[PDB]
Each structure stands twice: as C-alpha cells, then as structure tokens.
C-alpha cells in the first residue's frame, strides 16, 4: 500500500495555465487519513521566488479555510507579544537561489479527507532564447493520482516546446511525458502511475524526486506583439535577425584578500572563458581593484587574437591586494569607457557595457556608500548600463542593486558554490550580444492611464522587453505603439496597431481568462516595478511607492513584501494563525483546527 501510518496521498496535481507569458499555477493535494487516530499531515512544496501567492485553501471534511490577504503589519500583530518571530513561524521561507519552500503541518481528524490547494502567479521572463517553467516534484510518498498539466496559449504561436524530468530515466520519461504544440496551443501532460513512481520494481520509495522543467518560446517572425484586452495591454518586443552590435566592455574585478581561494579562481576561469568567446569587432579592458587600482591597458583595445591572449595571460597572473577600493575601481572603469567621447570617437557607435564583481564592501578610499552612488552615476551620466555581480553573502546587495538601478542596469547574486564560474558565464551571456540601444516604446498620451518602464538602455539577443499598461476608457479601439531605437550606425523604428479582429478571435479561443491574465500581468509587473523603484528613492517617496504597492497587492490579492495571508480557523500551541509571506532577499510548528479566538 502507498499509505504511511494510515495516511496516503490520494492525489497531487499541478495545473499551470500560461497565457501570453502570464503563468497561473494551481497545486492541489488531497491526503486521506484512514487511521482511527489523529494523524499529522504535511503540505510541502517549492515555489519560485519570482511568483506571488494569490490564494490558499484547506478543506477538511467540508470544513473550509481560506487565506485572507491583508496588510502585513496587521497580519503580524499576533507576533508582537509572542515567543516566536514571524519569520520563524511563517509557512514560507527561502530554500535556494530561485525557490521558496511552502510548508504547513496539520493534525487531521480520524477517517478524514483533507484537500490543500495553493495558487501562485508570475510573468515568465525570457532568457537564453526561451521561457522556463520549473516545478519541484517531491511527494514524500507514492501518489495514486499524480499529474502535471501545463497548458500554454500564445497569440504569436509556439516555436518550440520541451519537457525534461531529470529524475526519470530516459526510457521512463519517454513513455510518461506527453507533449505537443500546434499554432497558439501547447500542452504537456505527466501522469505517472504508482508503478512508474517506484524507484525499483519492488521497493516502496518513489523516484518522484527532482524538478520538472518545461521550456518554450514563441514565433518571432512578426515583430509586433501588442496584446490588448479590456482596457489593459501587454507589448512584447524582441526583434529577430538583427545584426550583433560591436560593444565596448570593461570588467572591474575585486582582488581583495577575501577573494582568496575558490572565488578568485572561479572569477579568473570565467574571465578566461569570456575573453575566449569575444568577437573580433569588440573592444575591452580590465580593471582590478584591491587597495590599489589597476587597469590592464588603461584604454579600450580591440579584441584581436594577440590582445585576447595577452588579456588571458594577465588574468591568470594577477595577485590579490588586501583592501577594497571600490570607488577607485568603478571610476577607473568608467573613465576608460568614457574615453570614447573624446579620445576614441571611432568606437562611439558601439554598445558600451560595464560589469563589476565584488565579494565585500569598500574599505579603501571612499567608503561613504551614498557618496559612491553619487560618484558613479555622475560619471556614467546614463551613457551605458552597469551590471553589478555580488559574489557571496558578505556584500551589501541592496547597495549593489541601487547602483545598477541608478545606471540603466541590474545586479545579480553569485553564490559561493562549485558552479560559480558557470553562474558568471550564465549572467554575461545575457548581456553579451546587444542588438539595439536607447529603446523607446511610445504610446499616445491621451490613451494611457498607467504604464510600466517604457525606456530601455539596451536590448540583448535571447532576452525581451515587455511593457504593460492600462488604457483610458474608449481609447482601446485605436490604441497603438511606436518603438524607436538605434543600432550600430542605424535607426530602428516600427509602429504596432491593435488588430481588433484578432483580439476578438483570441478572446474566443482562450476565453475570458485572456482578459483577466492580461490585467493581472499588468498588475504583477507594476507591483514588481514599485518594489524596485522604492529601493532607490528618498524615505518620503519610498512611503508613497509603498502605499501604491500595498493597495495594488490588496486589490489583486497578491502576497507581496507589503501583504500577508492569514488563515483564520487554525492555531498552533500558542494560538497563532498560520501566516504566509513573501520572504526577503536577505523549528517547525504544527497546527490544529481551532474555530475560536478571543473576542476584542
Ligand atoms: Mg572583499
């Protein structure tokens, strides 16, 4: 029998509906306690940090419980006088680089049937020429009816679709994973029988341990992907068949003593590989910063065979230099790229990129964090993006995120691990091939009530620009978009008009779910944008952005950093409600059913 201590997992189902990159997850688990005693049951799964929980329901023999979303402050008032912290008590916590762990332990009645259902949503982001859907599969028992169903609907059409299950042998995956796509519709169905779940023909344990990955991309022949539905729009921009731009890239590398060991080795290895794949038309230099600041050439040099080999030799040879002069290192790298303005104007049409890697905070020279931010942004002056890589967890990552945000870039975390070299290569490949610069998506001011970031410094091959917004009443029919940008010595310009007939056709094919997901796509991107914006503004404007993010989280019912989801009707030993939160970037209690709470 599958059951353990009288408890068996009758069914465990993951249902993912993807509509124009908006991914709607529903995970449903039904556990049955056949024992005549009380038994403890678990609902335990991993979800991506990028997603927002939107609903949670528990039904025990008709007794229904639902997560009520509210201001986080209100939800955590029960923790103030309590012996446990909300972080320790919460059902959700960080469990890895990109995933969070949702865990609840519940004492169920005898002869009981309990159904758990968790809903979470995200907008899939394109990277490396694909979208990726990752589902952590790990039932701590065999499941009678296990299913993963992914239903994809893309107006532009699906160009490719794949489904990989690492934990399954190639022969088992073939018979068990059903996938197909035609036109706008794609489907993946994974329905392993109990026999197919056992690791061995006559062993009790289940091989369903690992990750179920679904990847796809949409046809990009049609340069215009403007999707309008019920006063909300989503605009996807990723032109194909563009010529790679030549680029000027400077690497600013921390060589402080703390880098000693694996970090410097993995950093050097990544630089060697990056230099090895550089294209002849690019220009580059290298900057090292410890206590002293050091540049390989002091100016942008061409990526010739000799220069690349000399740079690789310089990478292999350098040694560490104690402290960390981050201000000097960045300003030096910026000075080199800015030579293109006066000394080297023949490189001015290239796309410029500045990448910085550090494992610690500034200890030499300018150490006032606010001053460094000022120094950097005043030197770059919006000419090129800055990509900060935080190596390990001794860096002030918020400091790195703000700096990149203030300079048309983003920050990325590098985890100290056996694959740090691949992480660095992985990130660089996202910015390695600029195709357009100064992308300006323009929409008629008379029609737009709200909109997301519409200016983007660089567009890279393999990635994508997405804009969403809300349309004013009676302006949807004539809605349009103009996209301007520059290539290397070229001007880019297109116009996208709503295809009214096509929208109605799409609405018929996908149903009213299309309207809802486009709006919720806008809400998701707007909330994320508010969370990003709030971190780089003064405390007064930060409160204003927070209130916008709070109100939108409540309106659309998202569990975000400003909201929590509480479950009335359950209590731990101290009478505390289950609480669900969004953990931040920086002892397992068990619950019982309790219908009473002290009256106010
Ligand atoms: Mg350091």
UniProtKB/Swiss-Prot annotation:
Statement: the UniProt record of this protein carries the keyword Transcription: no
GO CC annotation: blood microparticle; collagen-containing extracellular matrix; extracellular exosome; extracellular region
Intracellular or extracellular location(s): Secreted
Disulphide bridges: 200-203, 224-496
Family named by the database record: Belongs to the ITIH family.
Task of the protein: May act as a carrier of hyaluronan in serum or as a binding protein between hyaluronan and other matrix protein, including those on cell surfaces in tissues to regulate the localization, synthesis and degradation of hyaluronan which are essential to cells undergoing biological processes.
Subunit relationships: I-alpha-I plasma protease inhibitors are assembled from one or two heavy chains (HC) and one light chain, bikunin. Inter-alpha-inhibitor (I-alpha-I) is composed of ITIH1/HC1, ITIH2/HC2 and bikunin. Interacts with TNFAIP6 (via Link and CUB domains).
Protein name: Inter-alpha-trypsin inhibitor heavy chain H1
Native species: Homo sapiens (Human)
Source taxonomy: Eukaryota, Metazoa, Chordata, Craniata, Vertebrata
Gene designation: ITIH1
First-to-last residue of the parent protein present: 45 to 652 of 911
């Amino acid at each position: 029998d599958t059951a353990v201590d009288g408890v068996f997992i009758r069914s465990l189902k993951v249902n993912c509906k993807v509509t124009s990159r908006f991914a709607h997850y529903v995970v449903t688990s039904q556990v049955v306690n056949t024992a005549n005693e009380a038994r403890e049951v678990a609902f335990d799964l991993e979800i991506p940090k990028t997603a927002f929980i939107s609903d949670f329901a528990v039904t025990a023999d008709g007794n229904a419980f639902i997560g009520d979303i509210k201001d986080k402050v209100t939800a955590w008032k029960q923790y103030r006088k309590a012996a446990i912290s909300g972080e320790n008590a919460g059902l959700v916590r960080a469990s890895g680089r990109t995933m969070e762990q949702f865990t609840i332990h519940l004492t169920v009645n005898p002869q009981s049937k309990v159904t758990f259902q968790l809903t979470y949503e995200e907008v899939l982001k394109r990277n490396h020429m694909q979208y990726e859907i990752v589902i952590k599969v790990k039932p701590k028992q065999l499941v009678h009816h296990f299913e993963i169903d992914v239903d994809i609907f893309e107006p532009q059409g699906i160009s490719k679709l794949d489904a990989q299950a690492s934990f399954l042998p190639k022969e088992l995956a073939a018979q068990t994973i059903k996938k197909s796509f035609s036109g706008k519709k794609g489907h993946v169905l994974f329905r392993p029988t109990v026999s197919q779940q056992q690791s061995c023909p006559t062993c009790s344990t289940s091989l369903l341990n690992g990750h179920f990955k679904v990847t796809y991309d949409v046809s990009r022949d049609k340069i215009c992907d403007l999707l309008v539905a019920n006063n909300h729009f989503a605009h996807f921009f990723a032109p194909q068949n563009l010529t790679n731009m030549n680029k000027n890239v400077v690497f600013v590398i921390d060589i402080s003593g703390s880098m000693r060991g694996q970090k410097v080795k993995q950093t050097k290895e990544a630089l060697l590989k990056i230099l090895g794949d550089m294209q002849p038309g690019d220009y580059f230099d290298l900057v090292l910063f410890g206590t002293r600041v050091q540049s390989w050439k002091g100016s942008l040099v061409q990526a010739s065979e000799a220069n690349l080999q000399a740079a690789q030799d310089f990478v292999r040879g350098f040694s560490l230099d104690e402290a960390t002069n981050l201000n000097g290192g960045l300003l030096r790298g910026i000075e080199i790229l800015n030579q293109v303005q006066e000394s080297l104007p023949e490189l001015s049409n290239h796309a410029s990129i500045l990448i910085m890697l550090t494992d610690g905070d500034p200890t030499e020279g300018v150490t006032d964090r606010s001053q460094i931010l000022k120094n950097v942004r005043n030197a770059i002056r919006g000419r090129f993006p800055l990509y900060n890589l935080g190596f390990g967890h001794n860096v002030d990552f918020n400091f790195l995120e703000v700096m990149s945000m203030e300079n048309n870039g983003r920050a990325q975390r590098i985890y100290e691990d056996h694959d740090a070299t691949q992480q660095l290569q992985g990130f660089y490949s996202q910015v390695a091939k600029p195709l357009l610069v100064d992308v300006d998506l323009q929409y008629p001011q008379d029609a737009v009530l709200a909109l997301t970031q519409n200016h983007h410094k660089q567009y890279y091959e393999g990635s994508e620009i997405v804009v969403a917004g809300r349309i004013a009443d009676n302006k949807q029919s004539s809605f349009k978009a103009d996209v301007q940008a520059h290539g290397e010595g070229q001007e880019f310009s297109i116009t996208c008009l709503v295809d009214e007939e096509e929208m109605k056709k799409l609405l018929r094919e996908r149903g009213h779910m299309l309207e809802n997901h486009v709006e919720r796509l806008w809400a998701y991107l707007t909330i994320q944008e508010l969370l990003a914006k709030r971190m780089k503004v003064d405390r007064e404007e930060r409160a204003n952005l927070s209130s916008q993010a709070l109100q939108m989280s409540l309106d659309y019912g998202f569990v975000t950093p400003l909201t929590s989801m509480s479950i009335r009707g359950m209590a731990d030993q101290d009478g505390l409600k289950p609480t669900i939160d969004k953990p931040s970037e920086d002892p397992r209690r068990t619950f019982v059913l309790s219908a009473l709470q002290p009256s106010p």
